[PDB]
Design an enzyme around this catalytic site. Structure first.
Site, PDB file in Angstrom:
ATOM      1  N   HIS A 216     -64.645 -18.688-106.839  1.00 11.27           N
ATOM      2  CA  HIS A 216     -64.137 -19.416-108.247  1.00 11.27           C
ATOM      3  C   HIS A 216     -62.305 -19.820-107.737  1.00 11.27           C
ATOM      4  O   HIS A 216     -62.724 -21.320-107.913  1.00 11.27           O
ATOM      5  CB  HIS A 216     -63.511 -18.127-108.968  1.00 11.27           C
ATOM      6  CG  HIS A 216     -62.434 -18.661-109.870  1.00 11.27           C
ATOM      7  ND1 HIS A 216     -62.311 -18.920-111.503  1.00 11.27           N
ATOM      8  CD2 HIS A 216     -61.266 -18.628-109.451  1.00 11.27           C
ATOM      9  CE1 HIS A 216     -62.176 -18.257-112.257  1.00 11.27           C
ATOM     10  NE2 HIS A 216     -60.827 -18.612-111.063  1.00 11.27           N
ATOM     11  N   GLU A 217     -61.635 -19.808-106.054  1.00  9.96           N
ATOM     12  CA  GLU A 217     -60.837 -20.391-105.691  1.00  9.96           C
ATOM     13  C   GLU A 217     -61.003 -21.378-104.898  1.00  9.96           C
ATOM     14  O   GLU A 217     -60.513 -22.496-105.090  1.00  9.96           O
ATOM     15  CB  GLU A 217     -59.931 -19.071-104.549  1.00  9.96           C
ATOM     16  CG  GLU A 217     -59.410 -18.550-105.996  1.00  9.96           C
ATOM     17  CD  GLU A 217     -58.476 -18.755-107.194  1.00  9.96           C
ATOM     18  OE1 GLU A 217     -57.840 -19.909-107.182  1.00  9.96           O
ATOM     19  OE2 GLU A 217     -58.384 -18.553-107.494  1.00  9.96           O
ATOM     20  N   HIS A 220     -62.035 -24.379-107.166  1.00 12.76           N
ATOM     21  CA  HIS A 220     -59.978 -25.081-107.358  1.00 12.76           C
ATOM     22  C   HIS A 220     -60.208 -25.832-106.648  1.00 12.76           C
ATOM     23  O   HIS A 220     -59.364 -26.704-106.933  1.00 12.76           O
ATOM     24  CB  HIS A 220     -59.132 -23.709-108.061  1.00 12.76           C
ATOM     25  CG  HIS A 220     -59.717 -23.485-108.780  1.00 12.76           C
ATOM     26  ND1 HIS A 220     -59.300 -24.002-110.552  1.00 12.76           N
ATOM     27  CD2 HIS A 220     -59.147 -21.631-109.509  1.00 12.76           C
ATOM     28  CE1 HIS A 220     -59.175 -22.703-111.558  1.00 12.76           C
ATOM     29  NE2 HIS A 220     -59.252 -21.076-110.848  1.00 12.76           N
ATOM     30  N   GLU A 255     -58.541 -23.471-115.690  1.00 13.60           N
ATOM     31  CA  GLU A 255     -59.687 -22.506-115.645  1.00 13.60           C
ATOM     32  C   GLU A 255     -61.141 -22.024-116.301  1.00 13.60           C
ATOM     33  O   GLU A 255     -61.883 -21.851-116.132  1.00 13.60           O
ATOM     34  CB  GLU A 255     -58.697 -20.711-116.538  1.00 13.60           C
ATOM     35  CG  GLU A 255     -57.482 -20.801-115.489  1.00 13.60           C
ATOM     36  CD  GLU A 255     -58.073 -20.954-113.894  1.00 13.60           C
ATOM     37  OE1 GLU A 255     -58.694 -19.895-113.959  1.00 13.60           O
ATOM     38  OE2 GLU A 255     -56.697 -20.237-112.851  1.00 13.60           O
TER      39      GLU A 255
HETATM   40 ZN    ZN Z   1     -58.981 -20.211-111.732  1.00 16.12          ZN
END
Ligand code: ZN
EC number: 3.4.24.69
Length: 416
Positions: A216-217, A220, A255
């Site tokens: 997830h990170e 980003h 997000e």
């Molecule tokens: Zn996030």
């Protein structure tokens, strides 16, 4: 393998891939490990990237966890380094993860530091300063740093340094990303959607696989390295969960995009097209800037090498005379890869784990874990170890059945 060395924290410095470094107030050098081209790990709590976050005590929101002593000892740093390495290998072992990590390594932050159009120059905050064997510093460009969390241990996030006028994470340029992350803790969630999305119910029966959390990170970080992150001021004023509405909770489009699946569909087609066009325009700016540059600043790389790096990053077209342009078809394809293929929901499918079904839930608990021992967690199976009782039904993630792998530190249910 993604990481060729199985570093030990107490391995001797060599000034190359095991070194004391400084990041771009005053700080003491910190011991860091270069796990892959353009990617370093700093097994320290992040008291460095933000001046207002220089200590490790509480100022507490429900979903937070404090321990000023975590990640202070050599053994903890050794296990941190091993745990992060294992998660990179778990990610890289999937086709989707290999794709994402390749995109990340190719996503060199743009050389946008010149105020003279005819010159191309690095931005210093996309580098670290490395102590060489003779005790002096050299500057090394990098894309990604994994660092321990700041005061709130479970506030994981992608941080980067700005520029005085440039918005590097949103103008196509990109910047070196610092991911605050720990492999030593994870979140509990609930298997029934109507429980998971209710703040009053559930103790956190299932544990999130930390490979998903790191992925997830990294997603980003991919957005931010390509300068296509959506401004955090663009939010969904959630109106699909009565508890979110009671508290006025807003969730950023960045997000929702990163989670993917049905969450990303809360960004409507008109907004999707707006952002695609906005970022296309940023890539066009970059092509124009590259064309104006006729000399490079510094001596480490040629102008033609750096123009090639950015041709490859942004998938630019180059004519015979050497002029760049953005092909809208290739732009759309890359933009789609970074934003729709690289998603949490897609990683869940590759790892074959149980996970939250939406970002629009309520976290239930935090657990202490230890993924370093192979008897606990593996690159190939995570917690759900093959040829054991843990292989079926996500039993390895079931904190009741695999109770020796999880110790609950804090319940969040009832605190919202
Ligand atoms: Zn996030």
């Amino acid at each position: 393998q993604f990481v060729n060395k199985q570093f030990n924290y107490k391995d001797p410095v060599n000034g190359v891939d095991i070194a004391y470094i400084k990041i771009p107030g005053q700080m003491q050098p910190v011991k860091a490990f270069k796990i892959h081209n353009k990617i370093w790990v700093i097994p320290e709590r992040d008291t460095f990237t933000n001046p207002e976050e220089g200590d490790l005590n509480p100022p507490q929101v429900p979903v937070s966890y404090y321990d000023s002593t975590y990640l202070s000892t050599d053994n903890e740093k050794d296990n941190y380094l091993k745990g992060v390495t294992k998660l990179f290998e778990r990610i890289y072992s999937t086709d989707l993860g290999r794709m994402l990590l390749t995109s990340i390594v190719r996503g060199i932050p743009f050389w946008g530091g010149s105020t003279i159009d005819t010159e191309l120059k690095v931005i210093d905050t996309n580098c670290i300063n490395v102590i060489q064997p003779d005790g002096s510093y050299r500057s090394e460009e990098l894309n990604l740093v994994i660092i321990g969390p700041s005061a709130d241990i479970i506030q994981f996030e992608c941080k980067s340094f700005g520029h005085e006028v440039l918005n590097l994470t949103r103008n196509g340029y990109g910047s070196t990303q610092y991911i605050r992350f720990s492999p030593d803790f994870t979140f509990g969630f609930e298997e029934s959607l109507e429980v998971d999305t209710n703040p009053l119910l559930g103790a956190g029966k299932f544990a999130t696989d930390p490979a998903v959390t790191l992925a997830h990170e990294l997603i980003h970080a991919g957005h931010r390295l390509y300068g296509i992150a959506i401004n955090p001021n663009r939010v969904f004023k959630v109106n699909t969960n009565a508890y979110y509405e009671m508290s006025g909770l807003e969730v950023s489009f960045e997000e929702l995009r990163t989670f993917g699946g049905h969450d990303a569909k809360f960004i409507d087609s008109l907004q999707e097209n707006e952002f695609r066009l906005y970022y296309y325009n940023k890539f066009k700016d970059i092509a124009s800037t590259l064309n104006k540059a006729k000399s490079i600043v510094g001596t480490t790389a040629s102008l033609q090498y750096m123009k090639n790096v950015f041709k490859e990053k942004y998938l630019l077209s180059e004519d015979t005379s050497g002029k760049f342009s953005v092909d809208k078809l290739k732009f759309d394809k890359l933009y789609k890869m970074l934003t729709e293929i690289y998603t949490e929901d897609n990683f869940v499918k590759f790892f074959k784990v149980l996970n939250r079904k939406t970002y629009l839930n309520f976290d239930k608990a935090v657990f202490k874990i230890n993924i370093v021992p192979k008897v606990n967690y593996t690159i190939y199976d995570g917690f759900n170890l093959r040829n054991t009782n843990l292989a079926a039904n996500f039993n390895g993630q079931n904190t009741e059945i695999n109770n020796m792998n999880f110790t609950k530190l804090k319940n969040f249910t009832g605190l919202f």
